[PDB]
Design a protein around this ligand. Structure first.
Ligand SMILES: O=c1ccn([C@@H]2O[C@H](COP(=O)(O)OP(=O)(O)O)[C@@H](O)[C@H]2O)c(=O)[nH]1
Ligand SMILES: *[C@@H]1O[C@H](CO)[C@@H](O)[C@H](O[C@@H]2O[C@H](CO)[C@@H](O)[C@H](O)[C@H]2O)[C@H]1O
Ligand SMILES: *[C@@H]1O[C@H](CO)[C@@H](O)[C@H](O)[C@H]1O
Ligand SMILES: O=C(O)c1ccccc1Br
Length: 444
């Protein structure tokens, strides 16, 4: 009972969620955990503090208004390094005289400066990569190559330019985040372990390639236990949400009244923004089906005028935010039109829902390539090259290709094999269970 982990996610939904889920595993194994949330995020969730994972607050330098009040991404990340370094040190010091001092920092691999704080206080230090091995390996190769990548890549020859992360195909875009994803490897060989939110059996070739450069421990998937191994009965869903849902039994009740495999689920995660024109083609494309579509509140203005009040409430429904895990488990869902964020992708792969891949940026084009051509669990929509948008009739074709045809009945079979491989990996003796045990043993 001696070890104590301070877990520091990048302050966004797709990073806080896998960090918290991993903390629930550690707690089940006997390791005490504290999750470090920025003050802005903490005051937005109003979290329920009566739980097995304690909460501490740190600062990114934007306590009042968070990221949207920062001038720029580069200013945000530099100020987060400054204030985050000092406020993470504050938590360590405040726990020094306690019953269980902090002994280990699990920090988002996006924040390599947290290793320096852990090492200053003599702690165990492990970066946590929330993206899959193939993506991280691609970034590692570019980092070794002064931030460039010459295709073809010898060990992954099937990768074309349109499959690499967006920073390689959109020249000069988001230079501060490009630098961030490359500099995850600036010091990662000096950490006690390298953790990755994937499971070995999902990416055998890339895991072993990446491991040759630096030993990594796959510890995923971070899907709640009740849906897979079921050894942690208290782990029944995601319990830290940065977004309000109107208490959606509304959503699951409605899905129950629908025929099996009849609903197209459409969701673009917590972050990605679609243009006016993109929303136009999407709304026209999906209105050919029975659909459940998350349109985040900030995105509604880009819907075509009068769209919300012309959805027929017998076949279709539009939400501000969904209980995605419950949606993807419900049998009324025929396919998942997704931006190919890594958590959404892994959730779809484990629940056996075939995907229509509509990647937008960052690692999403990589996940899309793996969804279609490696795991063969869905189809990527084609975007015209001069314009860069996917029009309504290609989107509609891609959804049909996954709902009905001969291509359809193949991809349903393939995607159903991943759930068992994940349950095997999380159960006693599995790949991920063994790696989590290795980490827990070191921490204490
Ligand atoms: O309406 C929604 C949309 C997304 N999610 C959850 O939000 C996370 C999105 O993370 P992902 O890595 O897919 O995308 P990002 O948001 O990081 O771009 C996932 O855990 C989803 O299950 C949800 O609960 N409801
Ligand atoms: C990274 O930069 C992009 C803009 O290019 C921001 O969207 C992102 O900010 C995130 O925004 C989410 C809401 O859409 C917040 O939930 C999240 O906390 C915040 O980090 C930047 O991270
Ligand atoms: C950065 O750019 C992409 C568009 O390519 C968008 O999806 C994000 O919302 C934005 O932050
Ligand atoms: O890749 C991601 O998921 C990501 C998430 C949040 C902020 C920046 C990035 Br580059």
């Amino acid at each position: 009972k001696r070890g104590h982990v301070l877990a520091v996610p990048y302050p966004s939904q797709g990073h806080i969620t896998p960090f918290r889920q991993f903390c629930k595993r550690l707690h089940f194994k006997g390791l005490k955990t504290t999750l470090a949330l920025t003050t802005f995020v903490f005051n937005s969730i109003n979290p329920d503090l009566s739980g097995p994972i304690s909460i501490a607050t740190i600062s990114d330098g934007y306590d009042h208004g968070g990221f949207e009040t920062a001038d720029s991404i580069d200013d945000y990340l530099k100020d987060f390094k400054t204030s985050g370094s000092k406020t993470i040190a504050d938590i360590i010091q405040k726990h020094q005289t306690s019953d269980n001092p902090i002994t280990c920092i699990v920090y988002d691999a996006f924040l390599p400066w947290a290793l320096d704080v852990a090492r200053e206080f003599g702690l165990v230090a492990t970066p946590f990569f929330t993206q899959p091995c193939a993506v991280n390996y691609v970034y590692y190769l570019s980092y070794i190559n002064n931030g460039s990548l010459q295709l073809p890549i010898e060990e992954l020859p099937f990768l074309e330019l349109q499959d690499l992360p967006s920073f390689f195909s959109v020249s000069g875009s988001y230079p501060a985040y490009f630098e961030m994803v490359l500099q995850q490897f600036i010091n990662f060989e000096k950490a006690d372990f390298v953790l990755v939110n994937s499971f070995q059996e999902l990416e055998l070739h890339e895991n072993e390639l990446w491991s040759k450069a630096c030993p990594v421990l796959t510890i995923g998937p971070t899907i709640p236990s009740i849906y897979l191994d079921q050894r942690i009965k208290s782990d029944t869903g995601y319990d830290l949400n940065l977004f309000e849902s109107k208490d959606d039994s509304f959503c699951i009740n409605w899905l129950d009244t629908r025929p099996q495999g009849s609903v197209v689920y459409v969701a673009f995660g917590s972050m990605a923004q679609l243009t006016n024109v993109q929303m136009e083609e999407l709304a026209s494309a999906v209105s050919n089906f029975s659909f459940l579509w998350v349109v985040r509140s900030s995105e509604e203005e880009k819907l075509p005028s009068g769209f919300l009040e012309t959805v027929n409430k017998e076949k279709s429904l539009v939400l501000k935010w969904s209980p995605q895990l419950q949606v993807l488990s419900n049998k009324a869902i025929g396919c998942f039109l997704t931006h190919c964020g890594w958590n959404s992708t892994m959730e779809a792969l484990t629940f056996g829902v075939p995907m229509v891949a509509m990647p937008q940026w960052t690692d999403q084009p990589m996940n899309a390539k793996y969804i279609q051509d490696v795991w063969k669990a869905g189809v990527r929509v084609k975007t015209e090259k001069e314009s860069g948008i996917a029009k309504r009739e290609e989107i509609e074709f891609s959804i049909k290709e996954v709902m009905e045809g001969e291509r359809s009945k193949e991809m349903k079979k393939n995607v159903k094999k991943w759930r068992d491989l994940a349950v095997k990996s999380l159960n006693e003796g599995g790949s991920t269970d063994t790696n989590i045990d290795t980490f827990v043993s070191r921490v204490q």
